[PDB]
Design a binder for this molecule. Structure first.
Ligand code: ADP
Lengths: 621, 38
């Protein structure tokens, strides 16, 4: 079951040494290790190599789904013959259930499920039971509730050729595991029957189904077929069909769980009446007994997840089953951007618990709803066999638990850490204009970080008044719109981006030759050692990259950041000299509303692939 | 998987041409894609 790493690359720079150390670290049974890779060193190639050498099922955790998608695309290319999988929340958008006591307003759960994401989730969990050569790229969705892997495993329908089994008995088993008969619209999670042929569309597929051909009570053949075409893709001697749902509640357990929910309700109502929580008792009882009628009628009610722990018949406070449980005991976790991802993982339970206690306090939910929850960080720790944190700036968790850092500081094409200049706060804006103007003449772009909304808007406005092409990265710009703006910077539609936080997803672009840091000496979050080094990093994608920090004094964070930058650049230039390498970059209000409408139109015409209409609109613009 | 790989790759490249505003390339790619689907 080996990983086969496919790439146009060979390990370069100090990648071989980083790989060596990390592999030896796992051989030494080191639970925690940290890969201290400076930005642009190819840390994802390093991890690919680690994954190949250690050869365990591996979980890669990422802090946003844009980066998770980005890792997934890359790992599929790296391991085309192994099972690279994607595990993210299937919600296209998610408004959780919430209550605002201040305004006495309840927020209903609002959300739509993405069919492709649910598919990839099913593909992920079934793979863990089919083979060892599995890499999953996941969000913190990996610490959220899933049915019992033992049950999921156990509920598989196994079929093999020459097997005895009745056609209709197969139908019954498939229903029992949440497949639906649909002869007319045959989709995933669905079976269709034509005489002696059953076609099952696995929940893990939207592309290929399993055709099972009977002769009497015996399977003659099993074929992977193209669902739409009927074109045979291959014969199988064996197929495992996994449940179409990650939480199936058979009719027997549901009856009992309804027993237990009623009793819990009966006890909570008692306690609330004694404490004169009359409103909250009325509300809770209406809601719960309605939920309970629906379960008795349909075996389903909306927001049924609030009852997950009851439906399992497990005692209160029980750790949820998560994806972590689907993995063998001997698996590896890689935590991408660990300084961000680790605090996020810890923050999920507490955010969840806070939101749900205001619902239990005010009678919208039973206390058992809190058992429908992500893992506690102490629970996530229990799943750590070998964990490798990946970060240019490791957090205090990683630092504490790692005996020695594995450093990786050398870039494939020899690109250096930028030159840093410290310049006074006085004459700040004017000094910067000059540096921007000079970058404009050179067909290079600029990133600039301000501490405030106020300075960002003032400087953006002033730049615009001057004839400079600029965009303010406002904080409430979503990453989808962010990426559009960044694409436009790359194109030279803008020459400068001004933002408070430049550490937001996707801001590493080769065309940027200058990063300017206003108020570098104000510490806080924005001017911490971590923020400074990451911000410096944005200038390291360009062979003439440079940072300017405006500051009247050198704070502790400036010192560590400037020191580390200068130290790496030194070793990097030594490597380059010693290896014969030359660093090379890898690669008016009325007008305003008209442009925003035609742009939307141009973008719509592009999604529709009416590229001619999108051209007409670009030329209009 | 190899056909589907190239098709799926062509699509990426078409969306990318479009994001560069290189709608001329994107159309060239769309038209090739339609022939291959046929
Ligand atoms: N051994 C290698 N040879 C050539 N190119 C590489 C190698 N390793 C990584 N790269 C490429 O060099 C660039 C810099 O890597 P990147 O992934 O941005 O680093 P990081 O993940 O640390 O920010 C990327 O385009 C990456 O795919």
């Amino acid at each position: 079951d080996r990983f086969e790493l496919v790439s146009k690359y060979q390990p370069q720079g100090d990648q071989p040494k980083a790989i060596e150390k990390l592999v030896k670290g796992i051989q030494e049974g080191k639970k925690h290790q940290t890969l201290l890779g400076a930005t642009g060193t190819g840390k994802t190639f390093t991890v690919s190599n680690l994954i190949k050498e250690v050869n365990k099922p591996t979980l890669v955790i990422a802090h946003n789904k844009t980066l998770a998608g980005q890792l997934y695309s890359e790992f599929k290319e790296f391991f085309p013959n192994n099972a690279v999988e994607y595990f993210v929340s299937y919600y296209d958008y998610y408004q959780p259930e919430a209550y605002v006591p201040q305004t006495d307003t309840f927020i209903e759960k609002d959300a739509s499920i993405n069919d492709e994401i649910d598919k990839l989730r099913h593909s992920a969990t079934s793979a863990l039971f089919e083979r060892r050569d599995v890499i999953i790229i996941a969000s913190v969705s990996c610490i959220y509730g899933l049915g019992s892997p033992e049950e999921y495993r156990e509920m598989v329908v196994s079929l093999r050729t020459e097997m005895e089994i009745e056609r209709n008995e197969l139908l019954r088993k498939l229903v029992d595991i949440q497949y639906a008969r649909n002869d007319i619209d045959f989709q995933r999670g669905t079976f269709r029957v034509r005489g002696d042929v059953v076609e099952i569309f696995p929940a893990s597929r939207d592309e290929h189904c399993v055709r099972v051909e009977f002769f009497g009570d015996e399977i003659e053949r099993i074929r992977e077929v193209d669902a739409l075409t009927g074109e045979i893709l291959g014969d199988r001697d064996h197929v495992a069909i996994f449940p179409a749902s990650h939480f199936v509640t058979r009719a027997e357990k549901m009856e009992k769980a309804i027993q237990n929910i009623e009793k819990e309700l009966e006890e909570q109502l008692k306690v609330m009446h004694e404490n004169g929580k009359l409103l909250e008792a009325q509300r809770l009882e209406q809601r719960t007994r309605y939920d309970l009628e629906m379960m008795r009628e349909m075996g389903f009610c909306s927001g049924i997840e609030n009852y997950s722990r009851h439906l399992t018949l497990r005692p209160p406070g029980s750790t949820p089953y998560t994806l972590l449980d689907y993995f063998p005991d001997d698996f590896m976790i890689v935590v991408d951007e660990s300084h961000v991802t680790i605090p996020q993982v810890r923050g999920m339970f507490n955010g969840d618990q806070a939101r749900k206690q205001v619902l239990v306090d005010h009678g919208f939910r039973l206390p058992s709803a809190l058992d429908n929850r992500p893992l506690r960080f102490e629970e996530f720790e229990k799943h750590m066999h070998n964990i490798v944190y990946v970060s240019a700036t490791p957090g205090p968790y990683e630092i504490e638990h790692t005996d020695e850092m594995v450093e990786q500081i050398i870039r494939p094409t020899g690109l250096l850490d930028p030159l840093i200049d410290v310049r006074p706060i006085e004459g700040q804006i004017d000094d910067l204009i000059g540096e921007i103007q000079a970058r404009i003449e050179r067909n290079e772009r600029v990133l600039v970080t301000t501490l405030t909304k106020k300075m960002s808007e003032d400087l953006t406005d002033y730049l615009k008044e001057i004839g400079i092409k600029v965009n303010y990265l406002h904080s409430e710009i979503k990453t989808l719109e962010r990426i559009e703006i960044i694409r436009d910077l790359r194109l030279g539609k803008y020459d400068v981006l001004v933002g408070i936080n430049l550490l937001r997803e996707g801001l590493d672009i080769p065309e940027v030759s200058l990063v300017a840091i206003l108020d570098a000496d104000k510490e806080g979050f924005l001017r911490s050692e971590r923020s400074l080094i990451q911000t410096i990093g944005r200038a390291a994608r360009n062979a003439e990259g440079r940072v300017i920090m405006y500051a009247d004094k050198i704070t502790k964070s400036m010192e560590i950041a400037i020191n580390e930058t200068k130290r790496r650049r030194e070793q990097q230039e030594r490597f380059n000299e010693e290896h014969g390498i030359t660093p090379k970059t890898i690669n008016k209000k009325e007008r305003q509303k008209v442009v925003e409408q035609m742009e939307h139109e141009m973008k719509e015409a592009a999604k529709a692939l009416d590229f001619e209409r999108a051209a007409e609109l670009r030329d209009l613009l | 998987k190899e056909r589907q790989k190239v098709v799926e790759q062509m699509e990426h490249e078409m969306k990318e041409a479009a994001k560069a505003l290189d709608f001329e390339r994107a159309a060239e790619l769309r038209d090739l894609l339609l022939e291959l689907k046929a």
